[PDB]
Amino acid sequence: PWTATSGSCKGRCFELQEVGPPDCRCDNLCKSYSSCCHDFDELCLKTARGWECTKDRCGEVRNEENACHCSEDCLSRGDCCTNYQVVCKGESHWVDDDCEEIKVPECPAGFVRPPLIIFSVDGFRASYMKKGSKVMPNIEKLRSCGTHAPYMRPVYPTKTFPNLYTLATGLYPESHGIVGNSMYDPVFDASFHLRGREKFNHRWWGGQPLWITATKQGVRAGTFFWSVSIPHERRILTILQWLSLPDNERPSVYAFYSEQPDFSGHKYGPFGPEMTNPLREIDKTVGQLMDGLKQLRLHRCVNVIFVGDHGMEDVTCDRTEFLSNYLTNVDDITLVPGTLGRIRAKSINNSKYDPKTIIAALTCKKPDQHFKPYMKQHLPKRLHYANNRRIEDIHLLVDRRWHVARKPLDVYKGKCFFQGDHGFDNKVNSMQTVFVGYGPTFKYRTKVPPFENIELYNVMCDLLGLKPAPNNGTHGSLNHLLRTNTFRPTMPDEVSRPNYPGIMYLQSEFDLGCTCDDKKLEELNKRLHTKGSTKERHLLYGRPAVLYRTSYDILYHTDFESGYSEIFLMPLWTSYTISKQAEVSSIPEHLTNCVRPDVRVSPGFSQNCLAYKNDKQMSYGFLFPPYLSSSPEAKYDAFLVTNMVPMYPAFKRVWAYFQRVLVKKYASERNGVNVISGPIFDYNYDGLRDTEDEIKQYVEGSSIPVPTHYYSIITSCLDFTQPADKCDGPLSVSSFILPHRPDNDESCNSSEDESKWVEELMKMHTARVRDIEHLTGLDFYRKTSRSYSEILTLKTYLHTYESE
Template structure:
């Protein structure tokens, strides 16, 4: 008698279905893949919370054997074309010029242009990644990625399909596969592929329809990975799957013609409404803006907020382009704006809101031979992707293009790729007074681990039994950049005191302790209002955490370009004009989250327990939204990196410090680019 033992059929089935190894080993065995191609797939409108439905299993497998992020932030506004072009260039919309899906640029046209329906390269600033590669004779391909149809600087991808909505997703994937089957000498090294779902169905359909579309996407992605696996090419390709924005149900509709009386305007509809005064010259524009802002003042801050460019939160990076509206209606979740009822096209969901808000969060997944295994990144913004893609393609960064990403932010994603150490500024030195060093010894041990600056910056220390502080200033002038203070519960915090006069501008100390070390001109109403609220929250945090380090300073961004003007130029202007009126002020608060500060040192006992909360407040008299103190401060939170860009300072330097292990590059760059979503212990703060 012969007994044959056959394996179970479901074991055969399991082996057939798996495109990844259980041990997550990824090794390329094909000799003609010397340069590993990079495939970037965008799933339009795939919000982070869709992952929790566990429908798209391919992404879960990518996370297990590759890298994912808790979530990714888009750029403001969280619209399709602005964000896809930000991914392609590493630039904010204010820099690359695609500030909305609908654009008004009076220098090019006297009416709105739908950027989705034009290939006019004049609208696209910056250098997209396919141009960077094509200039170096590296072949690229685009499958419907926004902006690929435009000959930007006369260049387009070698392979570029004209958008065809009717092309099935199966055919699109087959096109990607066919490109990857090409011989090495003509195969694209970069493929950028765009899929319009689940965005299209989410705008007008219900949750069941969205789930059905997610199931379709899983079938398509599974087909792609299985096919590449069967070709024995999957482990030779680096793959990134991401999305551009999230999605939110609409429940509040506003019509601008019912809100303001001025009919001589242009208005771009959406959850972020942009209002333009096309017929006004520079001499009358500011009056029209002020007049209209007064009409909208305190209208309903629960559902939307109104800003001009100076008052917009700096973390939006949405002020320096002339294409940005003169007034922004910043919808809160669920709000949408139309010019009038006739143009309301009855969307049930939309996007464009503040990228910090949970429904706008997006996805990031990466898998491949040069991708770290099992890594979960802290949230980051999509402007960081450009530098990652350049590194994965082994392109010399010196041959790349300038961008708004932060060098090194996503280096931890890279595996088996040489990584250059980010360039950092040198530590600050003490200022010399009459050619002598100010102090033989400083009480500010660890200051150089906390902050550095341009080479012309130095610091003056002020130390006593009750005070540890330092002024950062230019070494060739009295132009002060920032004030650093270590404050504990024994230090009495002084609230700003208004003088009994009616001056519009008041010389005010930025010191959290009320010393006179750093004084600037602030608007009287600002001092009385939100600057006083900033002082109060600082005092609250001293009480809550016993000891904090506070860094305060002025910002001189008069042209609203969100970038630090040459310090010599600024300081020279200040010395000549004695003009100490900043456009904004900043404050950075450091705490030790799970440990204490070292005595007489600017270091936490557990170095990586260092935590930060930062603010940038405009020096303006009016808050047109009538926000309460904590809501206003929460709206004007900022990254450390935003303050660096506006001041020339640099936080948590690592490259030049012997004790660099305290703050390694990964910890430093993550904290510097961290987007603060909430105030600390908001329920315990005084209002």
């Protein structure tokens, strides 16, 4: 597009409103667009005399050619060097002052609300906070006086643009559209790349970023984007100048961005000796901002967020897996390479391209293979990485410390020159990044548990008094970060009330093709259990609330309670408690193939055994495990047709090991557990519960729908000295969402005993309770003694199984 660079930046330097059409620009992005007016450098990027006052410059006569000023008039003009008051007025640097609690905002007249400054640092690995602490005195003061987490979990892929735009929107990359640092949209036949102009087009960038949310609601916003060649000292000086604008013109939200330490980390590795200097330099920049805020009397008024996008791992050229070592047809594909792989067909006009044969040729081919292929819908649900046409059907998850590439010549175009990289699974320790919150709205000297970057947008909205756009955070889950909370969450209303059926059908009314070998005062006890006498033991936190319109029944039993769906012909949820002392037993010989009609539920709303006999692929399992029955008589309950769910034989290997061995291990380790298990249907891989008309597979000849996944939520007392069923304080939870697959190809060791691979699979598919809520339309923990904000934090917890 033609620019008339003929105009001037006089009185326009770093203007807030971006200009067109062929007119030249003076804003902080004009350099990226190559559209700055001819005099932008002269007027706007002054450098004379550097960035610091010195004794002899004090009270100088103003010289407008200087980078910053030491003249008497500078504070009124808003353009002193950040160390002016220290050098010329005997003041102390902010870092040398004692921490003092900020109980209330202390702001100059005309400030309507405390401003928010986001200070984002690329590649700032979480352990830098401890490991680089001797050389970062300013950052360490923010961290220990403010609110901080030991680390913050980024989104997958742990690349720069997906994570910065998640910070800004509160959305998963599948929903905001920025799904990697490089992308091809098939409906655009356009690529998006780090370097280039295509990324400037707004069509890639979905959702509603914080600056738009603010502007729509009458809060003014600084530019979050920075051109790479504007130096850091000039970015800081520009933010401080904007903060001296008149009340009607002054933004309330600002962002600073640093390319370091990422830039050096790629060259030298995360802990190369060359990394000390980039850390010192970011600390100095923090020092400049805080000294400048202190001059303008805003150091006890502004809220500051020091936040990273992802970490950095050791990665070298010789740790590259090559697709040419696996596939013959290597030139029929296009690969997006590196710390993750995405594979598509080279040519739309190629009809002999087979994803199925590509996966098979990539599956368990070499003993210590350093990647694993997945159809995108089979990736761990915790990654939320599938519901976007820019994400290719075929995906490779790459081991930490490794790369994937198509052919050797792609790498050794042969010397190396890179020692660090990122992009791996977001549960990986080296990928974690940082959060510090400092200012009047944050708590004083407070440590909070680790949390996910998707939650920050809601909190930044609360900090500015904005109503957040719809997003993937759970609003209220981070209230514990804040001294004054704008947001008080309330529980969603239950939409469907359950039926409580009694005995309504005679045995001979059922014609389900099922058989079971199952033919005083003990009689009253049986009825009590069926009516809910033990329900307080097995349903510890209330029944889950059904948040959509449906028909379902509550079923009580000695050992477990369930919510049984008349529409899906199976439980939506099944809840049971296993104490530390519980005994495991076997399924007796005469009960191996036992399935029993449930006389509370009509034949018309039941599964049938004939369908499973006819369907040669599909078998069945049970939600409450018969192995954990409390007595030989209660065990008959576990064989009810209302406790049955469809399972592939290959999946029953996983499920039976979980129910027979692991549940008991967890009860032993945690001093009792309460378990809620159920089916999930997500045939369109959008992370959301399917309606019945979205189901793509049924048990042959029937209306019994086949789940895509099975979940379990496992709860106990955070103080493990108290048993799960008598717990007075906070709770502890782990959960999973296992894919319901007809093979165990995902597990390369699946020919061995389950003791060698099953728990490993489960750990990979760890989940948050909130992930399960989205996928089921249920709302858990409705009746506890805990506060709702606390329950929201619990529902967002992810058990990661990483070491320390």
